[PDB]
Amino acid sequence: MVKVKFKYKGEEKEVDTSKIKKVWRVGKMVSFTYDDNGKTGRGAVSEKDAPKELLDMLARAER
């Protein structure tokens, strides 16, 4: 129930933490995939603007 607000190609978008599948660390940024209903979608936020739950998911994915 944590919401990640991200800009994709100049369009403001929002995806809940529960919908996110893959999270990666790319430089200063957190790039990710989520499940927009049947399809998969992609987005990214900077690590500075990221909510705590997203960053915890990132750390989990780095084991």
GROMACS .gro file of N, CA, C and O in nm:
model
  252
    1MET      N    1   0.084  -0.119   0.000
    1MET     CA    2   0.000   0.000   0.000
    1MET      C    3   0.088   0.125   0.000
    1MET      O    4   0.055   0.229   0.058
    2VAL      N    5   0.202   0.117  -0.067
    2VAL     CA    6   0.288   0.233  -0.084
    2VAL      C    7   0.286   0.271  -0.230
    2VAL      O    8   0.296   0.185  -0.318
    3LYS      N    9   0.271   0.400  -0.256
    3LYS     CA   10   0.252   0.451  -0.390
    3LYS      C   11   0.381   0.516  -0.438
    3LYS      O   12   0.441   0.596  -0.367
    4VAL      N   13   0.424   0.478  -0.558
    4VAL     CA   14   0.541   0.534  -0.624
    4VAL      C   15   0.490   0.620  -0.738
    4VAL      O   16   0.423   0.570  -0.829
    5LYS      N   17   0.519   0.749  -0.731
    5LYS     CA   18   0.480   0.844  -0.835
    5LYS      C   19   0.600   0.868  -0.924
    5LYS      O   20   0.705   0.914  -0.877
    6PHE      N   21   0.586   0.837  -1.052
    6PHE     CA   22   0.700   0.844  -1.143
    6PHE      C   23   0.656   0.907  -1.274
    6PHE      O   24   0.539   0.904  -1.312
    7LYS      N   25   0.752   0.964  -1.345
    7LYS     CA   26   0.727   1.027  -1.474
    7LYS      C   27   0.778   0.935  -1.583
    7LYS      O   28   0.896   0.897  -1.584
    8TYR      N   29   0.690   0.899  -1.676
    8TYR     CA   30   0.728   0.813  -1.787
    8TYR      C   31   0.707   0.889  -1.918
    8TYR      O   32   0.594   0.919  -1.956
    9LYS      N   33   0.818   0.920  -1.986
    9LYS     CA   34   0.814   0.991  -2.113
    9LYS      C   35   0.738   1.122  -2.101
    9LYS      O   36   0.667   1.165  -2.192
   10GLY      N   37   0.751   1.185  -1.985
   10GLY     CA   38   0.686   1.312  -1.961
   10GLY      C   39   0.543   1.305  -1.914
   10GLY      O   40   0.478   1.409  -1.903
   11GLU      N   41   0.491   1.186  -1.885
   11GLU     CA   42   0.356   1.171  -1.834
   11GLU      C   43   0.362   1.124  -1.689
   11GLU      O   44   0.429   1.025  -1.658
   12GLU      N   45   0.295   1.197  -1.601
   12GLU     CA   46   0.290   1.157  -1.461
   12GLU      C   47   0.209   1.029  -1.446
   12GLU      O   48   0.101   1.015  -1.504
   13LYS      N   49   0.263   0.935  -1.370
   13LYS     CA   50   0.203   0.805  -1.348
   13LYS      C   51   0.223   0.767  -1.203
   13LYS      O   52   0.304   0.827  -1.131
   14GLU      N   53   0.153   0.662  -1.162
   14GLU     CA   54   0.160   0.619  -1.024
   14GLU      C   55   0.133   0.469  -1.019
   14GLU      O   56   0.041   0.420  -1.084
   15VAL      N   57   0.215   0.398  -0.942
   15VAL     CA   58   0.197   0.254  -0.924
   15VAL      C   59   0.223   0.219  -0.778
   15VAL      O   60   0.319   0.268  -0.717
   16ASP      N   61   0.137   0.135  -0.722
   16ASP     CA   62   0.153   0.090  -0.584
   16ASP      C   63   0.271  -0.006  -0.573
   16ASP      O   64   0.311  -0.071  -0.670
   17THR      N   65   0.328  -0.013  -0.453
   17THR     CA   66   0.441  -0.102  -0.429
   17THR      C   67   0.407  -0.247  -0.459
   17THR      O   68   0.489  -0.322  -0.512
   18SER      N   69   0.284  -0.289  -0.426
   18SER     CA   70   0.244  -0.428  -0.443
   18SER      C   71   0.243  -0.469  -0.590
   18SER      O   72   0.261  -0.587  -0.621
   19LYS      N   73   0.221  -0.374  -0.681
   19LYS     CA   74   0.217  -0.407  -0.823
   19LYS      C   75   0.356  -0.424  -0.883
   19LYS      O   76   0.368  -0.485  -0.990
   20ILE      N   77   0.460  -0.375  -0.816
   20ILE     CA   78   0.594  -0.376  -0.872
   20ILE      C   79   0.651  -0.517  -0.870
   20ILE      O   80   0.636  -0.591  -0.772
   21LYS      N   81   0.717  -0.556  -0.979
   21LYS     CA   82   0.780  -0.687  -0.991
   21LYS      C   83   0.930  -0.680  -0.979
   21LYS      O   84   0.989  -0.737  -0.886
   22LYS      N   85   0.998  -0.612  -1.071
   22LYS     CA   86   1.143  -0.605  -1.075
   22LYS      C   87   1.190  -0.466  -1.037
   22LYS      O   88   1.133  -0.366  -1.082
   23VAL      N   89   1.293  -0.459  -0.954
   23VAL     CA   90   1.352  -0.333  -0.912
   23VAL      C   91   1.503  -0.344  -0.929
   23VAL      O   92   1.564  -0.446  -0.892
   24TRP      N   93   1.563  -0.243  -0.991
   24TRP     CA   94   1.705  -0.238  -1.021
   24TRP      C   95   1.758  -0.101  -0.980
   24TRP      O   96   1.685  -0.002  -0.980
   25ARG      N   97   1.887  -0.098  -0.948
   25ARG     CA   98   1.957   0.025  -0.917
   25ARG      C   99   2.046   0.060  -1.035
   25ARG      O  100   2.136  -0.017  -1.071
   26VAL      N  101   2.021   0.175  -1.097
   26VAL     CA  102   2.095   0.223  -1.213
   26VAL      C  103   2.146   0.362  -1.178
   26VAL      O  104   2.072   0.461  -1.189
   27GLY      N  105   2.271   0.371  -1.135
   27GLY     CA  106   2.328   0.499  -1.098
   27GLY      C  107   2.255   0.560  -0.980
   27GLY      O  108   2.244   0.499  -0.873
   28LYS      N  109   2.202   0.681  -0.999
   28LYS     CA  110   2.125   0.748  -0.896
   28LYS      C  111   1.979   0.706  -0.895
   28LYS      O  112   1.902   0.757  -0.812
   29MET      N  113   1.938   0.614  -0.982
   29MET     CA  114   1.798   0.588  -1.005
   29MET      C  115   1.760   0.445  -0.969
   29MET      O  116   1.844   0.355  -0.962
   30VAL      N  117   1.631   0.427  -0.947
   30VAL     CA  118   1.567   0.299  -0.924
   30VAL      C  119   1.475   0.276  -1.043
   30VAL      O  120   1.374   0.347  -1.059
   31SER      N  121   1.511   0.180  -1.127
   31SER     CA  122   1.432   0.143  -1.244
   31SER      C  123   1.352   0.018  -1.210
   31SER      O  124   1.401  -0.070  -1.139
   32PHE      N  125   1.229   0.010  -1.259
   32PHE     CA  126   1.146  -0.100  -1.214
   32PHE      C  127   1.043  -0.137  -1.319
   32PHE      O  128   1.014  -0.062  -1.413
   33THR      N  129   0.986  -0.256  -1.299
   33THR     CA  130   0.872  -0.306  -1.374
   33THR      C  131   0.758  -0.333  -1.278
   33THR      O  132   0.778  -0.363  -1.160
   34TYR      N  133   0.636  -0.321  -1.330
   34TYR     CA  134   0.516  -0.347  -1.253
   34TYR      C  135   0.416  -0.415  -1.345
   34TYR      O  136   0.435  -0.425  -1.466
   35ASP      N  137   0.307  -0.458  -1.285
   35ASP     CA  138   0.201  -0.530  -1.353
   35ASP      C  139   0.081  -0.436  -1.362
   35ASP      O  140   0.002  -0.426  -1.268
   36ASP      N  141   0.068  -0.365  -1.475
   36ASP     CA  142  -0.054  -0.286  -1.494
   36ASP      C  143  -0.156  -0.383  -1.552
   36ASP      O  144  -0.161  -0.410  -1.672
   37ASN      N  145  -0.235  -0.440  -1.461
   37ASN     CA  146  -0.335  -0.540  -1.496
   37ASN      C  147  -0.264  -0.648  -1.579
   37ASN      O  148  -0.156  -0.694  -1.540
   38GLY      N  149  -0.315  -0.687  -1.695
   38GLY     CA  150  -0.252  -0.795  -1.770
   38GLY      C  151  -0.114  -0.760  -1.823
   38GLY      O  152  -0.026  -0.846  -1.829
   39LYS      N  153  -0.094  -0.635  -1.862
   39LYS     CA  154   0.033  -0.603  -1.927
   39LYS      C  155   0.138  -0.569  -1.822
   39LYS      O  156   0.109  -0.550  -1.704
   40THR      N  157   0.263  -0.564  -1.866
   40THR     CA  158   0.372  -0.518  -1.782
   40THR      C  159   0.409  -0.376  -1.823
   40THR      O  160   0.407  -0.342  -1.941
   41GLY      N  161   0.439  -0.292  -1.723
   41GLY     CA  162   0.481  -0.156  -1.748
   41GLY      C  163   0.613  -0.128  -1.680
   41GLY      O  164   0.654  -0.199  -1.588
   42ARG      N  165   0.680  -0.024  -1.727
   42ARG     CA  166   0.813   0.010  -1.678
   42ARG      C  167   0.816   0.156  -1.633
   42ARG      O  168   0.746   0.241  -1.687
   43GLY      N  169   0.899   0.183  -1.532
   43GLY     CA  170   0.914   0.319  -1.483
   43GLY      C  171   1.043   0.335  -1.406
   43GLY      O  172   1.119   0.240  -1.387
   44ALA      N  173   1.068   0.458  -1.361
   44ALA     CA  174   1.189   0.484  -1.284
   44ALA      C  175   1.170   0.610  -1.200
   44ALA      O  176   1.104   0.705  -1.241
   45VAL      N  177   1.231   0.608  -1.081
   45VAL     CA  178   1.239   0.725  -0.995
   45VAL      C  179   1.383   0.738  -0.947
   45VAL      O  180   1.457   0.641  -0.941
   46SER      N  181   1.421   0.859  -0.908
   46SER     CA  182   1.552   0.875  -0.846
   46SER      C  183   1.550   0.818  -0.705
   46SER      O  184   1.447   0.816  -0.638
   47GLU      N  185   1.666   0.768  -0.661
   47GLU     CA  186   1.675   0.709  -0.528
   47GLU      C  187   1.639   0.809  -0.419
   47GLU      O  188   1.584   0.771  -0.315
   48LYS      N  189   1.666   0.938  -0.443
   48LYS     CA  190   1.637   1.040  -0.343
   48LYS      C  191   1.488   1.056  -0.320
   48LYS      O  192   1.443   1.072  -0.205
   49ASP      N  193   1.408   1.053  -0.427
   49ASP     CA  194   1.264   1.071  -0.417
   49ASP      C  195   1.190   0.942  -0.386
   49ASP      O  196   1.067   0.943  -0.378
   50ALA      N  197   1.260   0.831  -0.370
   50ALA     CA  198   1.194   0.703  -0.357
   50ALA      C  199   1.137   0.686  -0.217
   50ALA      O  200   1.201   0.723  -0.118
   51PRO      N  201   1.016   0.632  -0.205
   51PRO     CA  202   0.962   0.599  -0.072
   51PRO      C  203   1.039   0.483  -0.010
   51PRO      O  204   1.104   0.404  -0.078
   52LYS      N  205   1.031   0.475   0.123
   52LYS     CA  206   1.110   0.377   0.197
   52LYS      C  207   1.082   0.235   0.152
   52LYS      O  208   1.173   0.152   0.143
   53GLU      N  209   0.955   0.204   0.124
   53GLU     CA  210   0.921   0.067   0.086
   53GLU      C  211   0.988   0.027  -0.045
   53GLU      O  212   1.037  -0.085  -0.058
   54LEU      N  213   0.992   0.119  -0.142
   54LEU     CA  214   1.060   0.090  -0.268
   54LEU      C  215   1.208   0.061  -0.246
   54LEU      O  216   1.263  -0.033  -0.304
   55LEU      N  217   1.274   0.143  -0.164
   55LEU     CA  218   1.416   0.123  -0.137
   55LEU      C  219   1.440  -0.009  -0.064
   55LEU      O  220   1.540  -0.077  -0.089
   56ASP      N  221   1.350  -0.046   0.027
   56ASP     CA  222   1.361  -0.174   0.095
   56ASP      C  223   1.346  -0.289  -0.003
   56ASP      O  224   1.417  -0.390   0.007
   57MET      N  225   1.254  -0.276  -0.099
   57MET     CA  226   1.244  -0.376  -0.206
   57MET      C  227   1.373  -0.385  -0.285
   57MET      O  228   1.418  -0.495  -0.321
   58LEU      N  229   1.434  -0.270  -0.314
   58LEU     CA  230   1.562  -0.269  -0.385
   58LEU      C  231   1.668  -0.345  -0.306
   58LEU      O  232   1.740  -0.429  -0.362
   59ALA      N  233   1.678  -0.318  -0.176
   59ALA     CA  234   1.777  -0.386  -0.094
   59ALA      C  235   1.750  -0.536  -0.088
   59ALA      O  236   1.844  -0.617  -0.092
   60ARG      N  237   1.623  -0.575  -0.079
   60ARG     CA  238   1.587  -0.716  -0.081
   60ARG      C  239   1.632  -0.783  -0.210
   60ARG      O  240   1.689  -0.893  -0.208
   61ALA      N  241   1.608  -0.717  -0.323
   61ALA     CA  242   1.646  -0.773  -0.452
   61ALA      C  243   1.797  -0.786  -0.466
   61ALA      O  244   1.843  -0.865  -0.548
   62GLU      N  245   1.874  -0.707  -0.392
   62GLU     CA  246   2.019  -0.722  -0.388
   62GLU      C  247   2.063  -0.826  -0.286
   62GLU      O  248   2.184  -0.849  -0.272
   63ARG      N  249   1.968  -0.892  -0.220
   63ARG     CA  250   1.994  -1.003  -0.128
   63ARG      C  251   2.092  -0.962  -0.019
   63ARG      O  252   2.051  -0.924   0.090
   0.00000   0.00000   0.00000
